[PDB]
Design an enzyme around this catalytic site. Structure first.
Site, short mmCIF file in Angstrom:
data_model
loop_
_atom_site.label_atom_id
_atom_site.label_comp_id
_atom_site.label_asym_id
_atom_site.label_seq_id
_atom_site.Cartn_x
_atom_site.Cartn_y
_atom_site.Cartn_z
N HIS A 1 0.98 -1.54 0.05
CA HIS A 1 -0.54 0.06 0.06
C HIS A 1 0.41 1.11 0.05
O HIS A 1 1.21 1.11 1.08
CB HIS A 1 -0.82 -0.36 0.98
CG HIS A 1 -1.91 -0.62 1.00
ND1 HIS A 1 -2.20 -1.47 2.05
CD2 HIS A 1 -2.72 -1.86 -0.02
CE1 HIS A 1 -3.58 -2.81 1.88
NE2 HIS A 1 -3.64 -2.69 0.50
N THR B 1 -7.63 -0.09 5.75
CA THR B 1 -7.65 -1.46 6.60
C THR B 1 -7.23 -1.59 8.24
O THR B 1 -6.96 -2.88 8.57
CB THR B 1 -6.90 -2.43 5.44
OG1 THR B 1 -5.95 -2.50 5.85
CG2 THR B 1 -7.25 -1.87 4.21
ZN LIG Z 1 -2.62 -1.54 3.98
#
Ligand SMILES: [Zn+2]
Ligand SMILES: CNC[C@@H](O)c1ccc(O)c(O)c1
Ligand SMILES: [Hg+2]
Length: 256
Positions: A116, A195
């Site tokens: 990410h 998340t």
């Molecule tokens: Zn992440």
């Protein structure tokens, strides 16, 4: 506090962070046959040439490579995005085994890990204000599979020894995130969330179709990291991923 264990894991997060059960939570399963090609999507622009990394930190859940975001250097624009989003950090989620680790899934397929790259909307002045906005963040998600080594990842792999435990950090300058990108920028996009707690619904997700391949030896070193702090009982940093969450009639668009 929150973690990934039996007693503090994703299933428990809703108690401290009720938004866990919200209307635009991430990650999600990407059903390739349900996602629609969107012709109104502009080309994606990933401009990381002038990126300035500063340091790497074990925060007890993952490791963050942080960037200097005090001016327009590493930026994401185009695709579903309006305006300019500045790179602030990147981190990964990974498994205890190769058959799991990713947060997003593709037709229920789990990858070994997921990268990410987190960017904030420059219209909001800073990250802290951006995470109070529905279009505050853009996260570029990249899947990792086990195969050939990723040359551009080795610098990260080699520094991990110096940040084994929660709270440790190391200088990490002149790292080029361009070495982590696959060839194709084809992607799925949907509106979603962070998340990790507190799981804020401010993210435009851009998830690349093409995974990068990393070596078994590279992933193994990720798995040597610790959730615990120094001098505490060893808890291997593995399976730090949130599973797929309800789509709730959101639409996933494909760029291809
Ligand atoms: Zn992440
Ligand atoms: C402000 N930059 C975000 C990054 O440092 C970050 C990464 C993971 C987290 O859980 C968190 O609270 C913050
Ligand atoms: Hg938000």
């Amino acid at each position: 506090h929150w973690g990934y264990g039996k007693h503090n894991g994703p299933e428990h997060w809703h108690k401290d962070f009720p938004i866990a059960k919200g209307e635009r939570q991430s990650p999600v399963d990407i059903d390739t046959h349900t996602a629609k090609y969107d012709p109104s999507l502009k080309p994606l622009s990933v401009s990381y040439d002038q990126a300035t990394s500063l340091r790497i930190l074990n925060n007890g859940h993952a490791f963050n490579v942080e960037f200097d975001d005090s001016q327009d250097k590493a930026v994401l624009k185009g695709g579903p995005l309006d305006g300019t989003y500045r790179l602030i950090q990147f981190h990964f989620h990974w498994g205890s085994l190769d058959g799991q680790g990713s947060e997003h899934t593709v037709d229920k397929k789990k990858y070994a890990a997921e990268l990410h790259l987190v960017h904030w909307n420059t219209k909001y002045g800073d990250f802290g204000k951006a995470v109070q906005q529905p279009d505050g963040l853009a996260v570029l998600g990249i899947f990792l599979k086990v195969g050939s080594a990723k040359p551009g990842l080795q610098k990260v792999v080699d520094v991990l020894d110096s940040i084994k435990t929660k709270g440790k950090s190391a200088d990490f300058t002149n790292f080029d995130p361009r070495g982590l990108l696959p060839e194709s920028l084809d992607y799925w996009t949907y509106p979603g969330s962070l998340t990790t707690p507190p799981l804020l619904e401010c993210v435009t997700w851009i998830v690349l179709k093409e995974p990068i391949s990393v070596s078994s030896e590279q992933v193994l070193k990720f798995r040597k990291l610790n959730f615990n702090g120094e001098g505490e009982p060893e808890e291997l940093m593995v399976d730090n991923w949130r599973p797929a969450q309800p789509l709730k009639n959101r639409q996933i668009k494909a760029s291809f």
